[PDB]
Design a protein around this ligand. Structure first.
Ligand code: NI
Length: 341
């Protein structure tokens, strides 16, 4: 049944709750972003109102064929009224179109649902700064101190320098980047830009990227693989067998692959700096796993919460085990005692 942490008390609202059938007493279904664990259950036969960002609304219509009459896109950073309740959508610094949702309950309670997010000090100057938040439904994906990772900027610097060096040394090297969902587009876009190429991909992936309002996108991507030296493939194909196969398909245009897997975290991070990352190699194929995260590190998460000072925290991630739950609740208490709220 729908779990309590997807329900907004004092409202007819749910968040990211599309796989439980008709939820008793839900008048509006919010969707924070277009990732499959969150939209699981939506299709063209859905007949309740869906509230979301403009970009999420492009994807629902074009990829899942939800009918337009049931899609309710809202602008960001704007006070809006939904079934008599004031809401605001804020940028979540996750994937394109991902939002956090502020709800202003009729009784005076203020609730923030982060969706999936990567906490950033820039959020400390949105409409969040202007009032107190009583309850926080928090993306706790990496809520443990072992989860450190570099900034997105440091990681892109590494990938750009790596790719530019490899291809300048060997003009017949191909760069491949893996993907399985929207998000992390900077990886492949920044590499293509330094090499002066477009990124080549399947028709299905080109379609998906055309929904994202990325400026100058027609200048950056293409379905013509033959004209491109950066190719996108399914994440599943980023291994030695899958890459040998793809190299065969390129018809002797290339004699070397350098491939990137943007992982979230990998325990090489406890010991190793980004400077120090090395690939796995077999023959003329090298694979780098790079720690490009679209979720908060433990420190980023801590700073956000100690700034916000919520009265109650409700985790939305890692809630399935008692050990996880008890570990998170210990960190919440430390943070509160250290900051004094
Ligand atoms: Ni997500």
């Amino acid at each position: 049944t729908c779990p309590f942490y997807k329900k907004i008390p004092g409202t007819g609202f749910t968040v990211d709750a599309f796989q439980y059938g008709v939820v008793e007493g839900c008048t509006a279904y919010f969707l924070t972003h277009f990732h499959s664990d969150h939209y699981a259950g939506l299709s063209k036969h859905f007949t309740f109102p869906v509230y979301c960002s403009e970009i999420t609304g492009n994807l629902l219509k074009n990829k899942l064929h939800v009918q337009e009459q049931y899609i309710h896109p809202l602008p960001l950073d704007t006070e809006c009224i939904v079934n008599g309740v004031k809401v605001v959508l804020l940028d979540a610094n996750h994937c394109p179109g991902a939002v956090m949702i502020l709800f202003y309950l009729p009784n005076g309670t203020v609730i923030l649902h982060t969706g999936d997010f990567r906490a950033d000090p820039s959020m400390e100057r949105s409409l969040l700064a202007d009032q107190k938040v009583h309850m926080l439904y928090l993306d706790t994906t990496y809520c443990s101190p072992e989860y450190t990772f570099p900034s997105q900027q440091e990681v892109i610097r590494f990938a750009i320098n790596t790719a530019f060096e490899a291809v300048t040394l060997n003009p017949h090297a191909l760069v491949v980047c893996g993907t399985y969902s929207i998000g992390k587009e900077k990886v492949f876009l920044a590499i293509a830009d330094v090499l002066g190429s477009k990124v080549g991909m399947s028709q299905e992936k080109y379609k998906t990227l055309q929904c994202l309002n990325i400026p100058e996108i027609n200048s950056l991507i293409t379905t013509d693989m033959c004209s491109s030296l950066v190719h996108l493939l399914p994440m599943m194909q980023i291994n030695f067998k899958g890459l040998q196969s793809h190299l065969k398909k390129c018809g002797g245009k290339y004699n070397q692959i350098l491939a990137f897997r943007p992982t979230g975290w990998t325990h090489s991070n406890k010991f190793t700096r980004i400077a120090d990352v090395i690939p796995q190699t077999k023959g003329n194929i090298s694979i780098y796993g790079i720690p490009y995260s679209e979720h908060s590190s433990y420190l980023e998460m801590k700073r956000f919460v100690q700034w916000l000072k919520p009265q109650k925290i409700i985790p939305t991630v890692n809630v399935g085990t008692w050990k996880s739950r008890s570990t998170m609740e210990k960190y919440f208490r430390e943070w509160k005692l250290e900051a004094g709220y």
